[PDB]
């Protein structure tokens, strides 16, 4: 799932961390944390984490949030990777700290996206682009 | 097939070796190119004058039947079996035997398909065809240029040239006018009269 990239996949993979990394929910829904289970499309090989997306969809969970949203897996969307990258451009976007949002399995983000969102992510997921006034 | 043509001899030696050519007169006519439907009906006039006889495998054992009968086998140097034919027994006169089946000669519906003469007129088949269809069919003599929802083709005559006799006629064009000329078959190959063979004639002498 979902899947819709992009055109392209907005080029190479970069992560803040793979499996077992907290990033904030950045969402009006009362998920307060997002912890990764795994990432979609990772086919992977012998001993290698299923590694965080640059703006791609993930199997996640609400570890600390609303108890209703707590437990039960959730497809999400990575929004900003603390750990850095170069783009086809020659810039190195880098962030304060990791972040994403909990989302629908057609990609759609629920409420409104908080804070700054890398443009690649927006490009990937049109709903994301729609539901924010910050796309930097 | 698998047999003596199709099956063993002991069915067609029963109405061949038993039923001879032993009669007043005979005429050898081609009438196996016509359907049994109307042939069996016009067999009513044939069974009065005699009957039809023999399967055509025993045509070379007909010599031992012409020793018994007074008439010979080869009168005009023919065994009288070269195509699909019959032998009509006859007791009519020399001139009237030549018109005993020609007065009632007629074709019939076929099982493996046969031609019809396109010199004579083709009867009217399906009537009230589509206007577009009619327009398309330019080979029809009286054609239209699209008229209303429905229109007659208007054809009670031949739709193709006069000249093509039976054998080399267009059967594909007789499907356009479904009812086709039934005026073929039941014709004499030779006119035999017990030791006096005349040529095949449609009319009396």
């Amino acid at each position: 799932m979902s899947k819709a990239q992009a055109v392209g996949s907005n080029y190479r993979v970069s992560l803040g961390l793979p499996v077992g990394a907290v990033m904030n929910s950045a969402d009006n829904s009362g998920a307060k944390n997002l912890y990764v289970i795994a990432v979609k499309g990772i086919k992977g090989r012998l001993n290698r984490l299923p590694s965080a997306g640059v703006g791609d969809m993930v199997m996640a969970t609400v570890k600390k949030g609303k108890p209703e949203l707590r437990k039960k897996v959730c497809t999400g969307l990575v929004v900003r990777q603390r750990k850095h990258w170069k783009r086809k451009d020659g810039v190195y976007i880098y962030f304060e700290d990791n972040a994403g949002v909990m989302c629908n399995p057609k990609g759609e983000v629920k409420g409104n996206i908080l804070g700054p969102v890398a443009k690649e992510c927006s490009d990937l997921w049109p709903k994301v682009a729609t539901n924010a006034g910050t796309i930097v | 097939m698998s047999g003596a043509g199709s099956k063993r001899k002991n069915v067609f030696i029963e109405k061949a070796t038993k039923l001879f050519t032993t009669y007043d007169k005979m005429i050898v006519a081609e009438a196996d190119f016509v359907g049994s439907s109307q042939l069996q009906k016009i067999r009513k006039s044939i069974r009065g004058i005699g009957a039809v006889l023999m399967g055509k495998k025993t045509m070379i054992r007909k010599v031992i039947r012409d020793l018994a009968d007074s008439k010979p086998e080869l009168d005009a140097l023919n065994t009288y079996l070269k195509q699909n034919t019959c032998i009509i027994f006859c007791k009519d006169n020399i001139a009237e035997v030549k018109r005993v089946i020609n007065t009632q000669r007629v074709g019939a519906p076929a099982k493996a398909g046969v031609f019809a003469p396109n010199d004579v007129i083709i009867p009217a088949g399906p009537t009230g065809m589509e206007p577009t269809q009619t327009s398309f069919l330019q080979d029809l003599k009286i054609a239209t240029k699209i008229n209303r929802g429905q229109i007659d083709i208007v054809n009670e005559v031949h739709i193709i040239k006069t000249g093509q006799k039976v054998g080399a006629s267009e059967a594909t064009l007789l499907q356009k006018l479904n009812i086709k000329p039934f005026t073929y078959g039941l014709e004499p190959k030779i006119i035999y009269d017990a030791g006096a063979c005349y040529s095949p004639s449609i009319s009396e002498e």
Binding site: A132, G133, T134, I135, V136 | P131, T132, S135, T144, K145, I146, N147, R148, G149, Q150, I151
Partner: protein
């Protein structure tokens, strides 16, 4: 029109008889895109098709190709053209694909509808279901033919094929016409011709000059083979088209000078102009020349397409010029191949100039056609109508001028409500209350506020771009946001969304009402209003308020501040509707109840009762999940009532957790609804449905029942009935070959019964249930019956003046009129087929007079033993020959029941009984201050004298007695011969020559037989009659469709139930009888499982008690 406002429309909407209701409709929403596309462009309050396609309307090419994609929506499409108003409104009724009540409901939300009929297939369950209602109503529906630019663009044919297509359409429609009505003369009109203008003075006079030729209606005033005064159309939408015959005519007119009417006639069928100088010579009217469409009009279109394909800039322009219209602006602005076409078909598209006139010509007023649509659907009922004398107070004068009153009282009519907890836009807030502000918003929230919205959205959290000219400019709806407001307005606020919280009072519906204003009162009616109920389906007519006549007496009023369909949503501005309209109830009302028509009158004869069933009785006894949400389901079913006409919520016959539907998938849909769009719970479904009737074939043999039909000596009727059960629980004592009695006390209190067949007509009426519950119980307290006594007799023949049993009556002399009083348990539901036979005044304190059922007849006293009888034999009628289910298709007989039996048979069982009760023998006459024996004597009037010396207070105790009656009866049934009387709907399937065999095959596969065929007079269509069971008739239409292409149209009429060969058994509940071992296939069939999860049904009765009672679990059976 690009510019229209609601300020102009509200004034012109008040007046009536010059408005003309028009509606959009199709068989499965086929040709919906085309109709809508052309209308959107026309409409001005949405600002053309540039800022169009808002307020729910999803256009698709799939649909055109052939596709349903059904949806419930509405666009506010009013027109302030010239000097008049035009209440069109884009009605999109979803309907349903199979025949049903749903189809009847949804489709009836239309006045003066245009109907798209036959997509590329006819004579289906689709077309004969939805449009079955529309063509029945004489509302002057116009013939809309399918897309013609498919033949030009997609398939790529010449315009000559258009004619062919038209012809085909006509042919298709002929079949449809011949389902109802008659279509022997109309097969001539299912062609393409114009036989007029063959004369020399016409061929060069009215073809050069104008003159005039008639285009008026002929024979039929429906959609079958008529021009409808120049409103027939060829509706397309690939780049948007809005055109038809009129358009074609117009072009022709422009070439030399011929009248439009004349031209239209020519263009309906074929006409042959030679084109020398537009003058014709005869000879070409019997042979032909060249039809019109390929000569001119569509030829031009074809040429244009060709030009486009090749890519020519001036050629296209030339073609356009030739076609008799202006060439437009975008010819050297863009490269313009399709763009040019698009440009032209925004200038060309506003049909309001042409079509409105045509509409007017067709339809002088909506007042006229309203009189012809009352007698075509339910208004009094299925029997009578309001147009006839039954139910006539002030209706005939009212619906001639339309509406109930000219001052607007409001009414109701079901057309399926909107889904709550999603849309909840009707509110009690200032901006909908203020009717002007909302109107203003509506006219400004198409492409004007959109820019503002955009500005708000992108530039509020600050910095979307990084080092760009977005934050630098900071737009307030100026130069940047002006773009992207012509192809589609980005974020325009289409339906005026919810600013404040949800308060759901949404409803779809229809109402015809006069001039309604804001702050208008209506007298709200209760959850069950009796007066209303009493008015419908009978000749009664009266208007009075509650004086204790309804269940709830009330003197309260409800407000009604608006009339809305939710087409522009919220409390609208356009509320001043004329007599006759497409809108439903508004204000704070979503009550479209069955027994509560919202009116200003406190009670009135209901104008439309709820819709009728296509196939009678489709049910399922489901149960919900999790404990607190049990009444939730019930609550939901109150909302379900509002939506669909039939659900078992009002009046308990089978209990409130049961659906009532007509259809194949309708039931399924209903099931899904109460998980989704009503109550948000989740429930246990059970797709096995409809328990069949259990009929006993014949009586039992000589055992303890001497009055009988001789012998039951058969091996098996279909499955064995002798060795499968019985003969050892209470058969070791008596009966060798079976068991028709009991020996628990062992001849202290015993009985014997019989189950004969009963004639089928009689059964049918019984099972309809004409008798009431009060007709069989408590006649001393309530009123003593009279009209009901003879009716019963007419059905089941038995009386208190019959001392030779049931046998005499069943055989000889049917339909007598006598009193059938003093009956305990007349059937399983107390209104059914069974009866307990009185063949005695008094045996020995048994079998005479009910608990309080009387005919004013007594031998000595009314007192007898009615308490132990009535409860016992109710349970005997509810456990069949395989346990469970009601005895249906049966007239029960009681040979004898004898209490106070001083005889007895020496055995172990007897001994045990003796030990238990310490009785030397049974009685009632005597006592030792021991045991029980309850009777009717004690509660009615104390002691019993005359019929017996002492009252019954002795013999086996009452509970035990009650138990034992059930047991013996159960035993008797089990041993009797029985067959499965399967439930049936006869299939009167409209079929054609090629698809009879296929239909028959299906029937063969799924049980039944073809009885006979009836042929329609003068057509290739027929109607085949064939019985088919009810269980297999579900998913039938779909199957039919799959088999060929839906060329046969099914419709399931109810034709009683029949006996067919299937194994009528199910494993016995008693484990002593399961030692015989009923087989897993033949004594537990898949057809015979309608009981484990298909029998939880009780408004009236479904009680099954645990048999045998004898003190405690240690003292029940010790020597036994």
């Amino acid at each position: 029109m690009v510019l229209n406002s609601l300020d102009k429309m509200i004034q012109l909407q008040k007046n009536t008889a010059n408005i003309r209701n028009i509606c959009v409709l199709a068989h499965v929403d086929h040709g919906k895109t085309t109709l809508a596309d052309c209308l959107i462009s026309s409409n001005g309050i949405i600002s053309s098709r540039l800022a169009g396609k808002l307020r729910y309307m999803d256009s698709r090419e799939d649909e055109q190709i052939r596709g349903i994609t059904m949806k419930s929506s509405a666009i506010s499409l009013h027109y302030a053209t010239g000097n008049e108003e035009y209440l069109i409104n884009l009605i999109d009724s979803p309907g349903h694909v199979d025949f049903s009540s749903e189809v009847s409901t949804a489709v009836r939300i239309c006045d003066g509808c245009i109907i798209v009929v036959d997509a590329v297939e006819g004579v289906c369950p689709q077309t004969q279901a939805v449009l079955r209602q529309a063509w029945l109503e004489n509302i002057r529906p116009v013939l809309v033919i399918n897309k013609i630019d498919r033949l030009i663009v997609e398939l790529k044919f010449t315009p000559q094929e258009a004619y062919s297509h038209l012809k085909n359409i006509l042919e298709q429609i002929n079949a449809l016409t011949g389902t109802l009505f008659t279509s022997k003369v109309l097969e001539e009109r299912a062609e393409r011709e114009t036989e007029s203008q063959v004369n020399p003075n016409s061929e060069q006079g009215e073809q050069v000059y104008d003159w005039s030729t008639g285009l008026e209606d002929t024979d039929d005033s429906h959609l079958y083979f008529s021009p409808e005064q120049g409103n027939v159309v060829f509706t397309s939408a690939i780049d948007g088209w809005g055109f038809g015959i009129e358009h074609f005519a117009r072009i022709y007119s422009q070439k030399i000078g011929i009248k439009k009417e004349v031209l239209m006639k020519t263009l309906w069928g074929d006409y042959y102009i030679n084109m020398k100088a537009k003058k014709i010579m005869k000879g070409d009217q019997a042979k032909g020349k060249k039809p019109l469409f390929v000569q001119l009009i569509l030829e031009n279109i074809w040429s244009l397409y060709d030009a486009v394909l090749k890519k020519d800039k001036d050629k296209i322009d030339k073609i356009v010029t030739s076609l008799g219209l202006k060439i437009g602006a975008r010819e050297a602005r863009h490269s313009d191949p399709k763009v040019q076409i698009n440009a032209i078909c925004s200038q060309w598209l506003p049909i309001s100039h042409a079509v409105l006139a045509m509409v007017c010509q067709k339809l002088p007023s909506p007042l006229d056609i309203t009189a012809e649509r009352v007698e075509r659907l339910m208004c009094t009922g299925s029997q009578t109508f309001d147009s006839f004398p039954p139910e006539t107070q002030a209706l005939k004068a009212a619906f001639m001028k339309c509406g109930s009153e000219d001052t607007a009282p409001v009414i109701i009519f079901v057309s399926k409500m909107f889904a709550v907890d999603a849309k909840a836009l009707p509110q009690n807030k200032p901006r909908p209350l203020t009717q002007e502000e909302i109107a203003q918003r509506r006219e400004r929230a198409r492409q004007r506020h959109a820019e503002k919205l955009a500005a708000a959205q992108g530039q509020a959290p600050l910095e979307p771009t990084q080092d760009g000219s977005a934050i630098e400019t900071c737009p307030k709806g100026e130069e940047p946001r002006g773009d992207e407001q012509q192809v589609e307005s980005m974020t325009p606020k289409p339906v005026l969304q919810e600013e404040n919280n949800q308060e759901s009072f949404i409803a779809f519906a229809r109402v015809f009402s006069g001039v309604a204003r804001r702050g208008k009162k209506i007298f709200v009616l209760g959850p069950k209003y009796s007066p209303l109920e009493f008015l419908r389906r009978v000749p009664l007519g009266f208007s009075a308020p509650p004086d204790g006549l309804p269940q709830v007496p009330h003197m309260a009023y409800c407000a009604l501040e608006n009339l809305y369909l939710l087409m522009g949503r919220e409390l609208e501005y356009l509320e001043e509707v004329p007599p006759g309209n497409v809108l439903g109830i508004g204000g704070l009302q979503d009550f479209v109840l069955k027994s509560a028509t919202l009116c200003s009158l406190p009670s009135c004869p209901p104008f439309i009762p709820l819709n009728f069933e296509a196939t009678p009785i489709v049910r399922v006894a489901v149960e919900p999940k999790h404990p607190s949400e049990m009444p939730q389901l019930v609550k939901g079913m109150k909302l379900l009532n509002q939506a669909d006409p039939c659900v078992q919520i009002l009046i308990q016959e089978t209990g409130e957790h049961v659906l009532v539907t007509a259809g194949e998938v309708h039931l399924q849909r209903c099931l899904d609804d109460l998980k989704e769009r009503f109550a948000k719970i989740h429930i246990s479904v059970s797709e096995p449905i409809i328990p069949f009737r259990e009929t006993i074939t014949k009586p039992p043999k000589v055992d303890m029942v001497n009055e009988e039909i001789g012998k039951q000596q058969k091996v098996a009727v279909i499955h064995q009935m002798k060795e499968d059960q019985s003969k050892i629980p209470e058969g070791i004592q008596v009966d060798s070959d079976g068991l028709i009695t009991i020996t628990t006390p062992n001849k202290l209190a015993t009985l014997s019964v019989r189950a004969m067949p009963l004639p089928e007509e009689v059964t049918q009426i019984l099972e309809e249930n004409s008798d009431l519950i009060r007709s069989m119980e408590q006649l001393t307290s309530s009123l003593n019956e009279g009209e009901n006594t003879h009716m019963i007799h007419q059905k089941t023949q038995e009386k208190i003046w019959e001392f030779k049993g049931k046998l005499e009556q069943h055989l000889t002399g049917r339909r007598w009129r006598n009193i059938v009083d003093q009956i305990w348990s007349f059937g399983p539901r107390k209104c059914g087929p069974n009866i307990l036979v009185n063949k005695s005044e008094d045996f020995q304190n048994s079998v005479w007079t009910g608990p309080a059922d009387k005919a004013s007849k007594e031998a000595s006293r009314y007192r007898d033993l009615g308490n132990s009888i009535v409860s016992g034999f109710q349970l005997a009628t509810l456990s069949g020959p395989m346990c469970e289910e009601p005895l249906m298709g049966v007239c029960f007989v009681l040979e004898k029941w004898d209490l106070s039996k001083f005889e007895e048979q020496g055995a172990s069982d007897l001994a045990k009984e003796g030990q238990e009760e310490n009785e030397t023998c049974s009685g009632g006459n005597e006592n030792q201050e021991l045991q029980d024996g309850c009777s009717e004597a004690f509660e009615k009037r104390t002691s019993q004298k005359g019929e017996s010396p002492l009252t019954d207070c002795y013999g086996p105790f009452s509970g035990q007695l009650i138990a034992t009656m059930k047991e013996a009866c159960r035993y008797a049934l089990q041993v009797k011969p029985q067959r499965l009387m399967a439930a049936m709907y006869t299939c009167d399937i409209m079929a054609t020559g090629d698809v009879l065999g296929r239909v028959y095959a299906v029937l063969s596969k799924r049980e039944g037989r073809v009885l006979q065929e009836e042929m329609k007079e003068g057509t290739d269509m027929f109607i085949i009659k064939a019985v088919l069971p009810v269980a297999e008739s579900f998913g039938f239409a779909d199957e039919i469709r799959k088999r060929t292409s839906g060329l046969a149209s099914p419709q399931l009429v109810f034709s009683h139930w029949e006996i067919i060969p299937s194994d009528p058994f199910w494993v016995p509940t008693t484990e002593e009888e399961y030692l015989h071992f009923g087989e897993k296939a033949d004594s537990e069939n898949q057809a015979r499982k309608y009981m484990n999860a298909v029998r939880k049904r009780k408004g009236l009765y479904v009680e099954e008690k645990i048999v045998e009672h004898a003190e405690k679990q240690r003292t029940l059976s010790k020597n036994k």
